[PDB]
Amino acid sequence: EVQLVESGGGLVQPGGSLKLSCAASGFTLSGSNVHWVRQASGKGLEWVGRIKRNAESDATAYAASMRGRLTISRDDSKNTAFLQMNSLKSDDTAMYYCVIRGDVYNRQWGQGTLVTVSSASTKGPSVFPLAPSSKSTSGGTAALGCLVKDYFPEPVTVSWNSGALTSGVHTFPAVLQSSGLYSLSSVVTVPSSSLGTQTYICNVNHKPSNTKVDKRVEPK
């Protein structure tokens, strides 16, 4: 199998540092040119830097905006590429992507890792059920959900019935409240004839605060 594991992201304060990691599985990184591209929430794509392959003298280039604050390297013994970012500013907040330019995984992007530059502290969410009721029934369809409130930073992952329930699911983009904390709802529309028999659990994970909650949403 071919894979690109990305980590070393997360919450960091202004002026702080972060070392992002790009772990390759199934192919040798020393033979590829590794690039880094960021995307601020709802924005476009911005190249950050790259490290050429061994046969290309491991040559590095960096974005003008990241003015002598970047260090790209590779640990070939770990088969991993690194992006070291210093003196971080709030405008460096973005999803950072590792991009392979080579024989394998050519022009393909990793899932990315979210970097949040903020003076706000981590907060685990409160998970509340959005119970199905007559007010949440329209014909022979019922809607139900989970309110994932008061967390920081992003992201929050929500699944239903351990990934077995996907059809009719809408996990809403997080909205930053006036408190500086995020809140989201994840909903499901289901048949109302299944309300008393089928169990509906929402699986919430806020990795930044190590909060994992399996919440059963029951009618009434």
Binding site: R107, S138, H170, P173
Partner: protein
């Protein structure tokens, strides 16, 4: 730096109809071998960008016939001969001639479908949230098209202004619809002081605005 100018910034195409995206480079991207150092990426909602075209006109692996890249030197076109619901997302052109690599602004492709009225559901604060000392009323607008929708909140006939937040999902890759969540934030004391919580929805697909409400304490 090479500047990449994409055109249009958005477009709405009905499935089966063609789509064309322009990309203009500030510098020549032409190679000695006849190709161009120009790529096309698609970013689907909740996903990383994915390659479509490279060398100006070469399709990436698994990318079908309906997608084509053409142009030379500075003027580039991405064509989708027959648009499909799955094509919903943002398209970016990119130059890989030299460092820094540069992208166009991005083009959002909306899949145009038949007008669909939302299904509307209202959720009172949970007993568990009320226990924690807080109250959120959730109004759900499910699977609608177009995205323009208006939600009005009333608490005992009092128009709520500034105490609600909305969130819209991106266009669904299968049915081409949007979903919206509107949250009304109030203190537990204010929630307990009132009876009728009403969510009024206005959308093209409804002849008249639809109201979903509950009475606190089922009254």
């Amino acid at each position: 730096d090479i500047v990449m100018t994409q055109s249009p910034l958005s477009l709405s195409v009905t499935p089966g109809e063609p789509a064309s995206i322009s990309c203009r480079s500030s510098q020549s991207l032409l190679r000695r071998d006849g190709h161009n150092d120009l790529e096309w990426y698609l970013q689907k909602p909740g996903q990383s960008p994915q390659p479509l075209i490279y060398l100006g006109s070469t399709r990436a692996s698994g990318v079908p016939d309906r997608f084509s890249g053409s142009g030379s030197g500075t003027d580039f076109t991405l064509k989708i001969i027959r648009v499909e619901a799955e094509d919903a997302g943002t398209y970016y052109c990119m130059q890989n001639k030299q460092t820094p690599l540069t992208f166009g602004q991005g083009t959002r492709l909306e899949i145009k479908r038949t007008v669909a009225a939302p299904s509307v559901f209202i959720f009172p604060p949970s007993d568990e949230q009320l226990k924690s000392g807080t109250a959120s009323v959730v109004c759900l607008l499910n699977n609608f098209y177009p995205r323009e929708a208006k939600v009005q909140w009333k608490v005992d006939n009092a128009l709520q202004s500034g105490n609600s937040q909305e969130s819209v999902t991106e266009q669904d890759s299968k049915d081409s619809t949007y979903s919206l969540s509107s949250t009304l934030t109030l203190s537990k004391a204010d929630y307990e002081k009132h009876k009728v919580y009403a969510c009024e929805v206005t959308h093209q697909g409804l002849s008249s605005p639809v109201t979903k409400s509950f009475n606190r304490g089922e009254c």
